Structure 1
């Protein structure tokens, strides 16, 4: 009901042929690709698409985009799967209108989720209301990628236009968080799951960048201007300009000018505040800054990450500042960089010490021109699966049979992305 088994099986046959020298990769690729398509995607009563992030009836705007993105290739062939992806954009934009500050949404207005512990404005559609700038980038990215890869335009409907307007309004309000209607307190002993200053967050100055409460990891920002999410915002604001001009959408002149104004202001904020200096004295990107002079040197495996900046389309992989940042991220100068017997890579505040993330190994391969480095990382990913033949959230560098999240569809899909990239399937 969501795709053509005939068309998808033939496409996978072709990929397996292209990858015939890499049977270990094919086994995992097919397992990953089929599981997401068969077990996480459902068509709702209104013909729109709901994608399960994991193992409860809630969809993250972030995971759902990254889960479906690698199906864009076969959606060039499979018309029905093309509609399913369009239906996901439609669902995302509808939910953005329900509450543009929420990261995660229920399948229906059922009041499931975190309401018992969370003090914030809530409705029945909200699973979790952690505001993460990237949550609002991902649906815009998906709408744009669907259009570019397949030519599909039905996703650019009135709900799309209204939701785009909501995103621009919110990001603009959050250029000075003193004016924000958003507050968040969770009754928990885990500091990462709540906001300091009774739900308002840490101190900041106005920088031109847009404020975030939490990171793509779902843990709170230390400083409020998250460089990778503002990078992603700059990219998708470009997309908004393109889409409104091309499709002659309602209020395009106003929306295009607004998006451009905001893109330029965030870009100038990045120029003015996002940079710092590493141990060697090289200019690098910081992870989070507050505009008060504080700037962290680290990266988090969750995307958008600094490591993923070229993958997100923010800058060239060849860029000097990016490369210096990359060398810094992938070293012990980054406090989340962990080295062990099986692998070295990136952990997170979100997971245990010494556990590193497959998603960051995949992004590491997606952001190098060196095909030998891509192949090395793909070999490492499959070798570090604890014998499960799928991708986990994190695994211990000294023993990958110790890992978190048995079923992690976004991680499975990032592995698929790197295989396709290695094979020049584009």
Structure 2
């Protein structure tokens, strides 16, 4: 029992009626919305919620949050699903305590996943131990949004408090990666899947920002300060201060101060190091910097991205530097911007050349005030599905029957996000 079929069907009817002029949107929305709930979510022995990604049979801290986020609206009516989502926070925080450096986790201590190729400290709960700053943002974001959307507070238990302390500590240690206990080397010929310098990663200076090993694409950072994830960290560090103050949790005074101090330092770090200049001389955000003067000009479709900055709450969609960044990202000045017969959009080091991501099309829609652009991107999302009726990881710009990931629940849910945004559902 993860949700109430009766309440969810009624909410869907209400959505379908709001979107009645777009039957093509509705069919895709319902297929995607139903799939996540019936096929990716399960309640464990201990009453917590394990959420798998889809066609990779493991749980990402990133994916699992984005997967359940659109259910917050109906969770205001469906108290059972509200519990389910509180159980996901509970599972996430428990797994953070298991290993706060891992992106991905198993259903139990079973040693499924990548241990055989991977040289790092491991245990049987870990699917792979690729450290991505945003992996630790997402569970704090889910906890906060569950609280604000529904009023639920049961997720804020001793596990939550301990996991928050772990995150703050790890983020602090990673303000100077020289003190880090984390190393990762994978037996592979694909360099994006391992860390240079015998697992240490590329050179950097201290900036005040917090170091990451890998991106939310699961490919490794070129430079260690990944600006979108540090943007996300600043936001969720605000949530930490709100939750601890509103709820008088254990050690509130010390946690609020530690979180505030880290937030200020990461924010000062962004200010001092995160900006570069485009071909036209405009100030823009860099994607990755090292603090030694290198700064890449690009964006990757995975969230957190530069494109997603207003979506994650870091800045206003109206911000001048964001807008200049956006124009640079959605142009050939970005080496990952691809243009074909069916669509133009964002590819990734992680996917085949010429393949662009539905997640970034959705985010592009979510980060413009322009309703005609939202409607265009929705129509294109539906038209570039290879006749499947669901969202893929990536599809060829010249032929969307060429795609990756048959079953990618996170991407299905980002399509849902944009439809809800279009119908003014928030």
Give the TM-score range, shorter chain.
over 0.9
Tell me the alpha carbon deviations over residues 164-198 of structure 1, each in whole angstroms, 9 at most, x when there is no partner. 00000000000000000000000000000000000
1:351 and 1:57 map into 2 onto residues whose CA distance is: 19
Deviations 1:250-276 (A, max 9, x none): 000000000000000000000000000
Q: Give the secondary structure class of the aligned counterpart of 2:114.
A: coil
What secondary structure, in the 3-state scheme, does the structure 1 residue paired with 2:202 have?
Answer: coil
Q: Deviations over 1:133-168 (max 9, x none)?
A: 000000000000000000000000000000000000
Shifted more, 55-64 versus 11-20: the winner is 55-64
- Quote the Cα distance in structure 2 between the aligned partners of 1:285 and 1:201: 22
Shift of 1:56: 4.6
TM superposition outliers: structure 1 runs of 4+ over 3 Å = none
Residues 71-93 of structure 1, C-alpha deviations (whole Å, 9 max, x = no match): 00000000000000000000000
- 1:58 Cα deviation (Å)? 1.2
Distance in 2, matches of 1:57 and 1:191, equals 24
Q: Which runs of 5+ in 2 are unaligned?
A: none
* Secondary structure of 2:267's aligned partner: helix
Contact 1:57–1:107 (8 Å) recurs in 2: no
Contact 2:213-2:224 at 8 Å conserved across structures: yes
Counterpart Cα distance in 2 of 1:159 and 1:410: 25
Once the two structures are superposed, what CA deviation does each residue of 1:91-150 show, in whole Å capped at 9, x if it has no partner? Answer: 000000000000000000001110000000000100000000000000000000000000
What CA distance in whole angstroms lies between the structure 1 residues aligned with 2:349 and 2:381?
21
| SS across alignment from 1:84 | helix
In structure 1, runs of 5+ residues without a counterpart are none
1:265-299: per-residue Cα shift (whole Å, max 9, x none)? 00000000000000000000000000000000000
Q: Contact 2:42/2:51 (CA < 8 Å) preserved in 1?
A: yes
Shift, 1:232, TM fit: 0.1
The answer to whether the 8 A contact 1:361-1:377 is kept is: yes
Aligned residues: 426
Contact between 2:55 and 2:406, CA under 8 Å: does it hold in 1?
no
Matches of 1:273 and 1:258, distance apart in 2: 22
Q: Is the 8 A contact 1:28 1:382 kept in 2?
A: yes
Q: Aligned-pair RMSD on alpha carbons?
A: 0.4
* Paired residues of 1:209 and 1:270 also in contact (CA < 8 A): yes
* TM-score normalised per structure 2: 1.00
Q: Is the 8 A contact 1:210 1:225 kept in 2?
A: yes
Q: Cα deviation per residue 1:357-376 (whole Å; 9 max; x = unaligned)?
A: 00000000000000000000
Q: What SS is found at the alignment partner of 1:199?
A: coil
Distance across 2 between alignment mates of 1:378 and 1:282: 30
Say whether the 8 Å CA contact 2:55–2:405 is kept in structure 1.
Answer: no
